[PDB]
Design a protein around this ligand. Structure first.
Ligand SMILES: Nc1ncnc2c1ncn2[C@@H]1O[C@H](CSCC[C@H](N)C(=O)O)[C@@H](O)[C@H]1O
Lengths: 362, 58, 44, 395
């Protein structure tokens, strides 16, 4: 609520802009670096005082003529060097180390395109790349070996584009254009065996390649939440957020309100709807919001260029006291938003190669 | 063979259709689908368009 | 056998006016769309 | 690093050169054979015996090779190949069934440093191995099929060298007599014809200690069983004679070049001519009488050369190849012959031909009897190359 635009920069390529990323994987006192993916360019910046933003090292995919879609900050424990994975329409993952200035880990195998990227909260060597072919594959980048794949015979019959890790990394929600809500429990006794074995592999050990697993049976599924495409769901602790093109944001929990999320069987089909933070002027999908580091403040842009802001405090959809921040200069399409590792700096990115930084007015 | 019917295991007793149902090699040739004596294949990007199928053996 | 035809421009300007064998191309794991290796190319 | 970057650029280059070489290859070569093997083989040599099937252009030839692998069992392998004696027969020339295969496999230890068949009976062969003992085999007694148990039977193998090494030469006249070189700076001799049932391991009959450095090449005179010479990293070669009292004092000695030398080859026809390459991009030759004066030197190669051989049926032809991934052919009859400026800009008159059709470096090249105009060659990329030059160059 206590915010105002203080900075705004525009890229010269005029290409549509895509997923933003702020390096929350930092240390206290580190320079506050954030990254953003364009069509084929990748750019990084660091926020500075007075409203200044210093452009950092920026690259371009001059070989692959494709529109990058998703990116996720990365960190290496061995060298203590942070990185950031990227992805796009060609379904190829590249992970550039700013210390190395380059990417040397090449990962292909997805069918059509990649529309989601997110790391495990605890293990930085595990990543989920949601794909266009309805596939949910897992990679052990540290061993460069593939891990179990999700979906398959009883997975989503339509392209999935939105998924989320929980805070502890135990269950993974998934939603796509089919409006289905499928989640899988990481803690399933089988998987960490493979994850442990994913870290225990040698290509020269034997001719037999590593055996990644396959899953087709989510711990729960439904489609009643939205009658239109769903593109924004997040793990609000034990609660689940969900946003569609129908200009509404709804939070909900499985079964009845007293039912434990972890006690829910796959056969369950009941729903408990407790979210009404609705919006408007954003009837199109492929818009993504942002969250503060401490899960206390929600900010969502708008196609017409405004902001829809709410806190995660005792403020609840019983009244939904919205904060509609707006900058007149930005009205084309707010493609994404990104918070810092705090609630002080907000960077809003418009589609027309232009960004708009909002700093907290506290 | 003139019929569209594969010689049933309980019928073509002369070609060993019933004989050695566990074994893989039989005198008959029109009894394979029951036994599923499939050949080994290879998956590769076809020259014509996208993915294609290649046979491992002559 | 090289043809070793003699040079002739009257025919050449007017005209201007593969015994492989074996598993050539690389194959991929059908289950996971991943490249195979020759080491396991048999039991697969 | 930039060197890693440049090598990566070099990876593109070698692919380009092979593509470009392939494009021009048919109009300059009369035969193009290619085959890739599962595990690289360091050396290869043709079986002297050959047979040509009646009414069939493809001629039956047999090749012997070793095995070099990362961590698996190595084998001693003999392979057969069919090559069209008649090029008029146009499944390009023959049937679609293929013209090359492998027939013999026997468990091998380490990698074949050097292996040859003894001339008086090609069935019996000796193999230089990473182990100190030089293994000896005959494919007639041993099964053609590989033995999966992993056991090998180096029957009548040779002892006498403390470590492994390179350099093997059977006596062209004495049956069972061979000179072997090692890192022990010593040259060891055996008499297989005199070998009893002593336990299938034969100690060195005679040990020579002439070279100060690691002796890497040693060969008998192609006409004389008494005359032989050795070549080591000492950049100095020494000529030897049998029964010549102490085994460390050579009959003759001379420094071949300014860098290490590991390649020696006498002329089968001319007794006096003895070709000597070197690592300093230089190949030369010497005379049995004139040791002090070099007859001629060849320096077209752009890297080290350690494999040299004289062409069969052709006294005027000598060839050599090395790490430059190039093979150079030389005409002795054309040494210093006047040539047009379009030739001097291309190469010296003595330079007969230059071949570079292999992405990987070639470690061995070998022709065969009855076919003076084809050369087999083994590259690091497991590639077996056989090719025939156009007759036009030699009319
Ligand atoms: N010969 C051909 N030329 C162009 N398209 C073809 C084709 N044969 C099959 N197809 C297309 O392929 C589809 C069959 S599924 C096979 C797909 C194809 N082999 C690939 O991997 O890209 C059909 O819908 C058809 O449209």
């Amino acid at each position: 609520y206590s915010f105002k635009c203080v900075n705004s920069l525009k890229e010269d390529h005029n290409q549509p802009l895509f997923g933003v990323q702020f390096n929350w994987h930092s240390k206290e006192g580190d320079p506050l670096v954030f990254a953003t993916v364009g069509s084929n360019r990748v750019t990084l910046y660091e926020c500075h005082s007075q409203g200044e933003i210093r452009l950092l090292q920026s690259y371009v995919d001059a070989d692959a003529d494709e529109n990058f879609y998703t990116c996720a900050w990365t960190y290496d424990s061995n060298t203590s060097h942070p990185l950031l994975a990227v992805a796009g329409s060609r379904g190829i993952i590249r992970i550039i180390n700013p210390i190395t200035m380059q990417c040397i880990k090449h990962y292909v195998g997805h069918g059509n395109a990649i529309n989601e990227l997110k790391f495990h909260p605890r293990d930085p060597n595990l990543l989920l790349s949601v794909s266009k072919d309805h596939a949910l594959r897992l990679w052990n980048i540290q061993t460069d070996t593939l891990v179990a794949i999700f979906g398959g015979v009883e997975g989503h019959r339509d392209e999935v584009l939105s998924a989320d890790y929980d805070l502890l990394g135990e269950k993974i929600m998934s939603c796509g254009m089919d409006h289905s809500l499928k989640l899988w429990r990481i803690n399933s006794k089988r998987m960490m065996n493979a994850i442990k074995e994913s870290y225990d592999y040698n290509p020269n050990k034997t001719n037999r390649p590593f055996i990644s697993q396959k899953i087709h049976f989510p711990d729960f599924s439904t489609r009643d939440i939205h009658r239109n495409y769903v593109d924004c769901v997040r793990w609000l602790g034990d609660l689940i957020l969900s946003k569609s093109c129908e200009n509404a944001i709804v939070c909900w929990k499985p079964g009845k309100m007293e039912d434990d999320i972890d006690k829910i069987k796959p056969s369950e089909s009941n729903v408990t709807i407790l979210g009404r933070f609705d919006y408007s002027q954003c009837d199109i999908w492929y818009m993504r919001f942002s969250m503060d580091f401490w899960q206390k403040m929600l900010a969502l842009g708008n196609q017409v260029g405004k902001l829809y802001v709410w806190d995660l405090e005792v403020e609840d959809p019983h009244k939904a006291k919205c904060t509609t921040l707006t900058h007149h200069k930005c009205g084309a399409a707010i493609r994404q938003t990104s918070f810092s590792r705090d609630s002080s700096i907000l960077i809003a990115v418009c589609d027309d190669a232009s960004i708009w930084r909002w700093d907290r007015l506290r | 063979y003139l019929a569209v019917r594969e010689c049933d295991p309980d019928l073509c007793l002369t070609c060993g259709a019933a004989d050695h149902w566990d074994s893989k090699n039989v005198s008959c040739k029109n009894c394979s689908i029951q036994r599923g004596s499939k050949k080994h294949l290879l998956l590769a990007p076809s020259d014509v368009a996208g993915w294609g199928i290649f046979i491992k053996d002559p | 056998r090289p043809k070793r035809t003699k040079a002739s421009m009257s025919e050449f300007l007017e005209s201007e006016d593969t015994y492989s064998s074996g598993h050539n191309r690389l194959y991929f794991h059908s289950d996971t769309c991943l490249p195979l290796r020759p080491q396991e190319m048999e039991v697969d | 690093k930039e060197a890693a970057f440049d090598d990566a650029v070099e990876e593109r280059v070698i692919n380009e050169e092979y593509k470009i070489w392939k494009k021009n290859t048919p109009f300059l070569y009369d035969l193009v054979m290619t085959h890739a093997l599962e595990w690289p083989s360091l050396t290869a040599q043709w079986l002297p015996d050959v047979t040509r099937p009646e009414g069939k252009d493809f001629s039956i030839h047999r090749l012997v090779l070793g095995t070099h692998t990362s961590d698996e069992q190595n084998h001693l392998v003999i392979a057969s190949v069919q090559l069209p004696n008649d090029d008029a027969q146009f499944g390009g020339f023959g049937s679609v069934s293929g013209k090359i295969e492998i027939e013999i496999k026997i468990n091998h230890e380490g990698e074949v440093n050097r292996a040859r068949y003894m001339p008086q009976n090609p069935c019996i062969i000796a193999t230089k191995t990473p182990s100190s003992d030089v293994l000896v085999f005959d494919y007639t007694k041993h099964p053609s099929k590989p033995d999966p148990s992993g056991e090998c039977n180096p029957d009548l193998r040779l002892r006498g060298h403390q470590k492994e090494g390179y350099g093997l030469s059977w006596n062209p006249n004495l049956s069972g007599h061979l000179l072997s070189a090692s890192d022990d700076h010593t040259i060891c001799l055996w008499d297989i014809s005199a070998v009893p049932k002593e336990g299938k391991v034969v100690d060195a009959k005679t040990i020579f200690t002439g070279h100060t450095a690691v002796v890497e090449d040693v060969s008998w005179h192609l006409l004389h069983e008494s005359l032989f010479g050795s070549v080591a990293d000492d950049q100095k070669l020494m000529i030897w004679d049998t029964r010549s009292n102490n085994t460390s004092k050579p009959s003759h000695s001379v420094d071949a070049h300014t860098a290490e030398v590991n390649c020696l080859s006498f002329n089968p026809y001319s007794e006096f001519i003895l070709a000597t390459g070197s690592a300093d991009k230089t190949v030369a030759l010497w005379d049995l009488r004139n040791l002090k004066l070099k007859l001629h030197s060849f320096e077209s190669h752009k890297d080290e050369i350690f494999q040299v051989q004289w062409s069969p049926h052709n006294e005027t032809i000598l060839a050599s190849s090395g790490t430059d991934r190039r093979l150079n052919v030389w005409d002795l009859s054309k040494i210093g012959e006047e040539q047009s400026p379009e030739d001097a800009e291309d190469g010296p008159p003595e330079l007969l031909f230059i071949h570079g059709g292999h992405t990987a470096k070639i470690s061995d090249f070998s022709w065969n009897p009855n076919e003076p105009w084809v050369i087999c060659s083994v590259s690091e990329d497991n590639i077996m190359q056989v090719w025939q030059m156009a007759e036009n160059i030699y009319n």
